[PDB]
Design a protein around this ligand. Structure first.
Ligand SMILES: *[C@@H]1O[C@H](CO)[C@@H](O[C@@H]2O[C@H](CO)[C@@H](O[C@@H]3O[C@H](CO[C@H]4O[C@H](CO)[C@@H](O)[C@H](O[C@H]5O[C@H](CO)[C@@H](O)[C@H](O)[C@@H]5O[C@H]5O[C@H](CO)[C@@H](O)[C@H](O)[C@@H]5O)[C@@H]4O)[C@@H](O)[C@H](O[C@H]4O[C@H](CO)[C@@H](O)[C@H](O)[C@@H]4O[C@H]4O[C@H](CO)[C@@H](O)[C@H](O)[C@@H]4O)[C@@H]3O)[C@H](O)[C@H]2NC(C)=O)[C@H](O)[C@H]1NC(C)=O
Ligand SMILES: Cn1c(CC(=O)N(Cc2ccccc2)c2ccccc2)n[nH]c1=O
Ligand SMILES: Cn1c(CC(=O)N(Cc2ccccc2)c2ccccc2)n[nH]c1=O
Ligand SMILES: [Ca+2]
Ligand SMILES: [Cl-]
Ligand SMILES: [K+]
Ligand code: NA
Ligand SMILES: [Zn+2]
Length: 806
């Protein structure tokens, strides 16, 4: 109930919310059925339309009109956006040549350039090029301001998860909005687009930009606009707010458009019907910019034009049904669509088995258009696991497809030709970014980046201190003419030990054997120098990674590779090596097949042992620096040290061996040398963060040797490939991956074939940013380069996606 019989007289779109049962006039009142009786009459005028016409010029102010052409309108802040063009002989903003904005050009009393967020739903990246003929205002913004070829949304590439990530800089797993449809088990509540449940604050974690601004004394317009409020009224409300007195005027504003997403669903992304919505959005941009020019704010305001996600061709006849795979299809609940999420229909059943459900969904049809995963097995780059609202079973759906439970749900719940929500690396899901204003650069193209990074930039743009978030502050400094934020390298917490030869062979009882007993002062001073780090300039190209937590570890030097060896985890945290274009692949000599040698630098008690691997019938081992790449027969014995060994499932050894034996050489060959840093990752609670020792759930049997959940590698070369990796004078190029360490290869439906038909495809799926590896290991890479830190941060957030050109 609300006593909704007061007045909006003079309070249309008020900035502070009055609490019911006193009637409201803010743009949420509709949504609460709490507007005053006269809200529509006063606050939603429509008479005479949105544009001034010649005969309206200098009219008598008639307060009934939607907007004004009278003489006093500029001062009242409520002209139609084309007033000065039609009545004062001015030009439209879009017709003016663009001129660099070196400094903010703001009216007196403006303490800072305002920020206007212009967000567009379903605005696919390729609309920028493909609809450019019909979007001249947006095209001016793009080409005169700062723009990226595309911006990467978060997964799932749904509307609420993406708008709320833009507002907070958090992954959906952290902010809580994990889909457009959710069930929380602790709430026993369901969140959907339809309904009032979504209005409860309990769903929305993190700290959104409007709250960050308010707490630090920067005033915000409202971000939400009622569906029925026309775009023209939204623009005019923003322009009015910008005319308010200094102490009342907000500094941050948002506009939101339901287009082109609304039409995209009906007609597909490139439907003939799509041209008009794009014309309409452009016209709205034109109105804002003309309105700004009228108030002399068009060289004062920073404007962000930003989409939440793209749109893909999706039809009913491209639906996979779970009823075609499962016999017990009525015992499950599916969140359906462009992603699947499965849980038990009832938790008062103990005969429900996620493993048999997964088994029944794995590689069952030759052309299967989805793949099941336990959520902790999803590619780490999606950061989609660490929330109770995300079901244990997940289905990644092929682009262009849907998954549904039964056929009845598709004809009793074709409508659509477009949808979105797929893996965020998919081209059709990419969206847009343009920054225009005094704080952004002039006519600048920047590389594609992730939408998680913008919260930090918007905080910079408003002199705010960002709440803790998943952006890497400084990674987008290159978008900005002038920067609030100067990033600094985090301090190393643990410094290394540099052990020398301290143990005799016979002190070890590791159950290891090696055929190494075959014997010169030339090649003896030489091997000493190798163990003291003479070749370290070659294998450690960007300085040793810094360890950012308290621990105990040793640097180990070798001819071919250097490592940071953890005495706590009994294996390296990182192993670093350079393979030049010229370098040769050899095989492991027959006599050295089962060779594992004690490391006389490292005590028996801080070593692994071969016996545990013998007793453990599931678990074998591999090496971080590959024997296959040893520079000499003599150097190869180094690769067999117990300190280079790591636990590996035989199924995973197939993946690993193929990478070390075939792929490193190929990359070296294509990229003109590569530097490789490889190591273990432990993330048993799937939160994307390095596990402490007391979190490890699995050990090689009868030992203290912890089993990694994943193995990473970071592969760096010179961006200018005419220079070799080991002699690069400019920017770097990197690709990385975090491979799940799995006892089977069920993920790859083709794994019975040769490694050359499936392994690379799997690695591509599990591509990662260096930054994801930093979170997962507590290491910090690229500490010693010739490059600026902002550029390095940008490098660390790069993701190699393996998609073709947008
Ligand atoms: C992406 O960026 C984000 C943001 O920076 C990173 O997430 C942070 O990670 C931190 C480490 O995991 C985490 O810090 C913990 O916070 C606990 C208190 O948190 C509350 O307050 C904050 C601040 O206002 C708030 O953000 C939190 O909000 C969460 O919960 C609400 C409601 O439940 C949600 O609405 C909201 O979405 C958010 O949920 C998300 O985070 C939680 C974890 O907090 C997840 O579980 C959810 O699934 C969801 O993802 C909270 O309201 C604090 O109590 C913790 O302290 C414990 O651990 C430390 C270790 O140092 C120890 O010293 C303490 O004593 C304490 O231990 C005690 O509790 C243990 C477990 O209960 C128990 O075993 C012990 O016996 C002790 O009693 C801890 O400091 C921080 O909260 C989040 N922030 C957010 C927003 O998620 C994220 O890591 C980044 N991602 C990547 C990949 O880098
Ligand atoms: C709720 N909420 C939100 C989200 C929000 O503010 N709105 C605006 C809103 C506020 C109140 C009622 C309706 C919409 C919203 C709500 C649902 C769907 C889409 C946006 N963020 N923090 C918080 O706590
Ligand atoms: C969605 N939506 C909005 C826009 C909106 O509410 N938010 C706030 C919001 C908060 C939480 C979820 C979604 C939006 C927004 C606006 C611009 C950029 C980012 C977010 N207006 N009408 C509508 O229907
Ligand atoms: Ca963890
Ligand atoms: Cl969803
Ligand atoms: K074994
Ligand atoms: Na398989
Ligand atoms: Zn949509």
């Amino acid at each position: 109930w609300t006593a909704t019989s007061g007045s909006c007289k003079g309070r249309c779109f008020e900035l502070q919310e009055v609490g019911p049962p006193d009637c409201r006039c803010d743009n949420l009142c509709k949504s609460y059925s709490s507007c005053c009786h006269d809200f529509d009459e006063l606050c939603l005028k429509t008479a005479r339309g949105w544009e001034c016409t010649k005969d309206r010029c200098g009219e008598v102010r008639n307060e009934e009109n939607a907007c004004h052409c009278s003489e006093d309108c500029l001062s009242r802040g409520d002209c139609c956006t084309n007033y000065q063009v039609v009545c004062k002989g001015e030009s439209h903003w879009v017709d003016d040549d663009c001129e660099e904005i070196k400094v903010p050009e703001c009216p007196a009393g403006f303490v800072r350039p305002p920020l206007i967020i212009f967000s567009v739903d379903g605005f696919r990246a390729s609309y920028m090029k493909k609809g450019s003929k019909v979007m001249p205002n947006i095209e001016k913004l793009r080409s005169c301001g700062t723009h990226a070829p595309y911006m990467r949304p978060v997964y799932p590439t749904k509307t609420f998860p993406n708008l709320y990530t833009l507002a907070t800089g958090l992954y959906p797993e952290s902010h809580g909005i994990v889909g457009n449809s959710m069930y929380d088990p602790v709430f026993d509540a369901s969140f959907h687009l339809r309904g009032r449940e979504k209005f409860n604050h309990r769903w929305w974690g993190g700290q959104p930009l409007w709250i960050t601004a308010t707490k630090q004394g920067v005033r915000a317009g409202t971000f939400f606009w009622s569906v029925s409020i026309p775009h023209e009224r939204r623009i005019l409300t923003i322009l009015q707010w910008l005319s308010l007195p200094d102490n009342e005027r907000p500094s941050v504003y948002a506009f939101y458009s339901e287009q082109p997403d609304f039409s995209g669903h009906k007609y597909g992304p490139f439907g003939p019907e799509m041209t008009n919505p794009l014309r309409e959005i452009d016209k709205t941009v034109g109105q804002l910019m003309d309105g700004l020019k009228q108030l002399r704010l068009h060289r004062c305001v920073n404007v962000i034009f930003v989409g939440d996600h793209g749109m893909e061709d999706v039809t009913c006849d491209r639906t996979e049904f779970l009823s075609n795979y499962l016999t017990n299809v009525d015992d499950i609940t599916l969140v359906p669509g462009t992603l699947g999420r499965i849980r038990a229909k009832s938790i008062n059943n103990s005969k429900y088995d996620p493993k048999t459900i997964i088994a029944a969904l794995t590689c069952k049809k030759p052309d299967q258009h989805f793949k099941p995963y336990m959520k902790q097995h999803l590619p780490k780059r999606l950061h989609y696991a660490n929330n109770r609202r995300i079901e244990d079973i997940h289905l990644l759906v092929d682009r262009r497809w849907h998954v549904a439970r039964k056929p009845l749900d598709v004809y009793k719940k074709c409508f659509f030709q477009g949808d979105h929500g797929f893996d965020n690396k998919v081209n059709s899901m990419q969206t847009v970014f343009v920054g225009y204003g005094p704080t952004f650069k002039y006519r600048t193209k920047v590389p594609p980046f992730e939408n998680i990074e913008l919260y930090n930039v918007m905080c910079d743009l408003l002199g705010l201190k960002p709440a803790p978030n998943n952006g890497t502050h400084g990674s987008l400094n290159h978008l900005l003419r002038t920067n609030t934020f100067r990033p600094t390298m985090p301090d190393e917490v643990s410094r290394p030990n540099y052990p020398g030869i301290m143990y005799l062979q016979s002190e070890f009882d590791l159950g290891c054997t090696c055929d190494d007993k075959v014997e010169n002062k030339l090649e003896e001073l030489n091997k000493r120098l190798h163990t003291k780090g003479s070749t370290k300039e070659r294998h450690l190209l960007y300085g040793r990674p810094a360890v950012l937590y308290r621990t105990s570890y040793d640097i180990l030097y070798h001819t071919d590779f250097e490592s940071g060896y953890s005495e706590i985890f009994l294996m390296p945290l990182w192993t670093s090596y350079t393979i030049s274009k010229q370098a040769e692949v050899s095989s492991i000599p027959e006599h050295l097949t089962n060779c594992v040698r004690p490391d006389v630098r490292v005590s028996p008690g801080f070593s692994q042992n071969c016996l545990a691997y013998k007793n453990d019938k599931q678990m074998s081992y591999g090496f971080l620096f590959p024997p296959y790449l040893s520079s000499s027969p003599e150097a190869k014995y180094d690769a067999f040290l117990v300190t280079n060994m790591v636990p590996m499932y035989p199924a995973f050894k197939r993946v690993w061996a193929y990478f070390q034996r075939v792929l490193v050489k190929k990359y070296a060959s294509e990229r003109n040398g590569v530097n490789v840093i490889s190591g273990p990752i432990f993330d048993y609670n799937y939160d994307g963060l390095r596990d402490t020792e007391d979190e490890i759930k699995q050990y090689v049997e009868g030992s203290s040797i912890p089993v990694p959940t994943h193995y990473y590698s970071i592969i760096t070369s010179c961006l200018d490939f005419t220079q070799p990796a080991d002699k690069c004078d400019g920017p770097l190029s990197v690709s990385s991956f975090i491979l799940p360490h799995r006892p089977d290869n069920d993920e790859s439906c083709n794994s019975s074939e040769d490694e050359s038909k499936w392994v690379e495809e799997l690695m591509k799926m599990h591509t990662a940013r260096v930054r994801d590896i930093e979170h997962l290991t507590g290491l910090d890479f690229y500490r010693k380069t010739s490059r600026s830190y902002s550029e390095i941060l940008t490098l660390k957030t790069y993701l190699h996606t393996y998609e073709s050109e947008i």
